Amino acid sequence: LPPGPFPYPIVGNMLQLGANPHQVFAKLSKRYGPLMSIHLGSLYTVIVSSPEMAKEILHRHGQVFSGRTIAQAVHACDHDKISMGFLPVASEWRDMRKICKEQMFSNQSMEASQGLRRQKLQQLLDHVQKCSDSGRAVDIREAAFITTLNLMSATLFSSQATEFDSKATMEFKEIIEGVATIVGVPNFADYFPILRPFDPQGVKRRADVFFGKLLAKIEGYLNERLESKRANPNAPKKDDFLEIVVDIIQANEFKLKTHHFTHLMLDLFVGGSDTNTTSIEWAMSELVMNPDKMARLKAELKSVAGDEKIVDESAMPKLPYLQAVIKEVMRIHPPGPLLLPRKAESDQEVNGYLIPKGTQILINAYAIGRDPSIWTDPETFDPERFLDNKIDFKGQDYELLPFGSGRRVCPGMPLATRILHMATATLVHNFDWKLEDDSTAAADHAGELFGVAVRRAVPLRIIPIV
Ligand code: HEM
Ligand SMILES: [Mn+2]
Secondary structure, eight states: OOOOOOOOOOTTTTGGOOOEEEEEEHHHHHOOOOOOEEETTTTTEEOOHHHHHHHIIIIIITTTTBBBOGGGGGGGGGGGGGGTTSOSSSSHHHHHHIIIIIISSHHHHHHHHHHHHHHHHHHHHHHHHHHHHOOEEHHHHHHHHHHHHHHHHHHOOOOOOSSTOOOOHHHHHHHHHHHHHHSOOOOOGTTOOOGGOOOOOOOHHHHHHHHHHHHHHHHHHHHHHHHHHHHOOOOOOOOSSSHHHOOOOOOOOOSSSSSHHHHHHHHHHHTTTTHHHHHHHHHHHHHHHHHHHHHHHHHHHHHTTOSSSOOOOOGGGGGGHHHHHHHHHHHHOOHHHHHHHSSOSOOEEETEEEEEEOOOOEEEEHHEEEEEESSSSTTTTTTTGGGGOOOSSSSOTTOOOOOGGGOOOOOOOHHHHHHHHHHHHHHHHHHEEEEOOOOOHHHHOOOOSSSSEEEEEEEEEEEEEE
């Protein structure tokens, strides 16, 4: 087996992990190497911590390592048996991946929904403008969360509510927060198989409630669209993912049931929520903490957008510094620092070590992004490192893996980058910014809180200036 820290009876290595396990794993891998054994109680895990080993696991042996380790929480509403995020690579997963790549996240689809998203960007601008008038700080975590939910709702469901903090959006927010609280803490049933039939912390039961609420909402939207289409056969077609779902269901060419589609919408909605919210906040934190970089981005946006307040998504090729800024945020702050777990589908030798069937595989993208043998001055926020650099986060550069790579690489990437780029551009282009309170600025920026997505422990509060 790969080398690793001595595991104690019962607990294995769990007592050493602390509040930020990705940081502890990063330190440990400097000692034990880029394939490292970790015993999470009885859940045997191998941590992968170099571009070389990431390529061996995700690419060379990409089929063997194409499964997922499935948390007990994911059994909520039988999601484990239905979800593209957790099913093994087989016909159902392949069909859903095809629908995502060719239909939902196609260039045509993303382009068709730019208008839907533009409304939500305008609402963010309005919210910040009100704060600017009163000289009050913007809670960037809250504003990013609401904006992300709005942009996701707009794209998935054509939600066109005129209030920034609409009823539907705030209901989604409560559900997403609920999921995060449930899963952000260790479920002992994941680590001790004898506890699985007991659900001793009520994690699965509580997840049932929140997944159930999300599924009921999505089912309601689907039913409403089905009826509205039946009743209005001459109305123009909507430009959202729900329209695609209806058309696929009615064409009946896939061996998939209605529940595959509703659980798929659930995965897309949840998938894009905490990840984008935390990333927008980190982007703003980095830019405010590094004023020369804020100035360079503002200058780019001024030259391209001029007096226009809301940048067109189609202008992205004209904005290389904005692209570089977001690559650099992804390098330093991958929202899932250990990605999503993979699993060995069979015994496989890698670099002379046996990885047994069933092993949980965690790619420490955070460690790779901060490794000084890979990235010069890795703790420095330096978007210029990406200018005229072909390195990207699409999965082909094993130094930069915030969306993963190989078989299960993030399918929402085309929508995620539009959300990250446009929310960041909207905030930066339209206002100057200062910290509400800078007395502990450096500590506030450095301190992370582990969870579904890693976040700044102290929410970023910044005052917009005209
Ligand atoms: C900045 C935002 C995002 C980051 C950093 C991110 C990151 C990831 C990562 C690391 C994985 C696992 C990849 C692997 O196993 O190799 C993933 C899977 C997934 N993501 Fe994303 N994601 C983001 C936004 C989104 C968005 C916007 C959607 C939907 C619109 C989405 C939907 C999914 C789904 C459904 C999977 C499961 C794919 C599978 O297992 O086949 N994510 N995400
Ligand atoms: Mn189950």
